[PDB]
Amino acid sequence: VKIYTKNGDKGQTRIIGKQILYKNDPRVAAYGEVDELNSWVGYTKSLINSHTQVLSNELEEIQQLLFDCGHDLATPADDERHSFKFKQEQPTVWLEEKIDNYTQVVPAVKKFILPGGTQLASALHVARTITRRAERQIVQLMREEQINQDVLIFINRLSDYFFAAARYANYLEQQPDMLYRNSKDVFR
Amino acid sequence: VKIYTKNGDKGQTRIIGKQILYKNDPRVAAYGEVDELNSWVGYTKSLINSHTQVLSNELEEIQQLLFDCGHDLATPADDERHSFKFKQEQPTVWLEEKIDNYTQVVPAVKKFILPGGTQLASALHVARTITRRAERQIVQLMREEQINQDVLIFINRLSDYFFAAARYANYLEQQPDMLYRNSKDVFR
Amino acid sequence: VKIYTKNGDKGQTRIIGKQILYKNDPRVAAYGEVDELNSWVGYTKSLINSHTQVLSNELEEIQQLLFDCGHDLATPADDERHSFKFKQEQPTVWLEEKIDNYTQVVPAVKKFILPGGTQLASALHVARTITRRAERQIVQLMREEQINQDVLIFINRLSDYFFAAARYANYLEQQPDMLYRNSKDVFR
Ligand SMILES: C[C@H]1O[C@@H](n2cnc3c(N)ncnc32)[C@H](O)[C@@H]1O
Ligand SMILES: C[C@H]1O[C@@H](n2cnc3c(N)ncnc32)[C@H](O)[C@@H]1O
Ligand SMILES: C[C@H]1O[C@@H](n2cnc3c(N)ncnc32)[C@H](O)[C@@H]1O
Ligand SMILES: [Mg+2]
Ligand SMILES: [Mg+2]
């Protein structure tokens, strides 16, 4: 088995189905950014400690879901031989329940917080912002091609999950969040 | 409080003031990249150790400043109800004084260095390059819309700060920098 | 020595040779993304432990090679005073030999794996995906300007190297890889 085929050496790559695209095509960029997020989630999970073990399984579950999203991003809406398989309903509800629970448990803020704290909380803020970068890429693709809009819904919700989980990670080690000193009351 | 409004689920988001933009709009991308930098700075600060404690407070101060920059990037120059609040003078002087001090104290190089060393020094090099990525985004926005040019000045200077601070972090643990083996003398 | 010249404060920067470009120009973006990768490789190397010491030297060698690639990306193909110096043959063979060896030694998969595991393996997956992001940037530049195509070949191969090395890092700590649960058999 050779994972290097060399077929990409001139700048084109195969997507799902027959088409080849330049590697900078917005479709390739979209699922490539999802893959970068997925790798960062793996890195974040590797930082789990005894205080934060309760977050481990759901990070692995998110990795599984990000593969399901990437599949659909790699699939043209008019490819007769392949169809969209990601459905947002249940995964997105699942994220919302976590967001509600973690928002309830941590100390309430009205103001923006500095993205930081523990190493794990900080990594969850990095995940938050890479998710949002991948979301931008997905919207770029959406403006040119038909996509599975359920992926967008889920990826939008996912960055709120990472915010909530980052605060929960600080709570699990009793690290206080720090406020942005010039913040207005923005959370209502 | 629900941080998930779902109003972003179709790919548009609210900026400062009345306007909504696509999430891939260059303005949204610019302050989104600043937020990614800010999160990375949080992560970097979480790596502080007893040798490097002297760097902790100024990283937190940079996080505060990055919120002030992001505010102005999110604000249209013609929005009557909101105005630019970031002024570069004092923060940028403050960075320059750190850059001068840290450049003086560490072993002099003429050649490019490998970006690495200690975990903290390496993270400061990652911060250096994410700052430069955010700067590119800010210039993309500048070419289409009027911006607070003071944010650009500060963000330019900030990546030189991260270079200087990365070298200082290696110095604080007595980790030598490594040279790029084919470098010309580039620092003059 | 002042690394801050302030000449970049209005959004333009000097490349190799006489030209100045906007900081968001695709050329500047391409070698800037290579620099971000290089910094991440430095960070990854800082995570080496006693189990993974055998990977340290080759990560440093990759950093040297990434400077050689960045040089050529910063050099216009028609700049009479500067020429391309990167040749892919030997570095790319060297990567392929590592990929072959590491593919042979680790447990065989047919299915996609979750990008994660140990902290080092996870960082090598982050390197994999940042390499692929830089590759996209390089292809963007290739579509507008003549480049040294040897850089593209090497950067393509490099992300397969990081995949193989990430799996090898997990093997070195006897951390099993996890499969994507809905994967088809994709590695043939
Ligand atoms: C909190 C604020 O963050 C901005 N916002 C919403 N989604 C994204 C994204 N994917 N990338 C960057 N910024 C975003 C909007 O301005 C929203 O109101
Ligand atoms: C050191 C060199 O790095 C380049 N340079 C300057 N600013 C940036 C940036 N934001 N992103 C990437 N590269 C940049 C220019 O080529 C400068 O001369
Ligand atoms: C494994 C699959 O990953 C995609 N692919 C190939 N190169 C890149 C890149 N630089 N960025 C993102 N995705 C890429 C193609 O779809 C290939 O078949
Ligand atoms: Mg959102
Ligand atoms: Mg600069």
Ligand SMILES: [Mg+2]
């Ligand atoms: Mg490839």
Ligand code: NA
């Ligand atoms: Na490959």
Ligand code: NA
């Ligand atoms: Na939200």
Ligand code: NA
């Ligand atoms: Na400089």
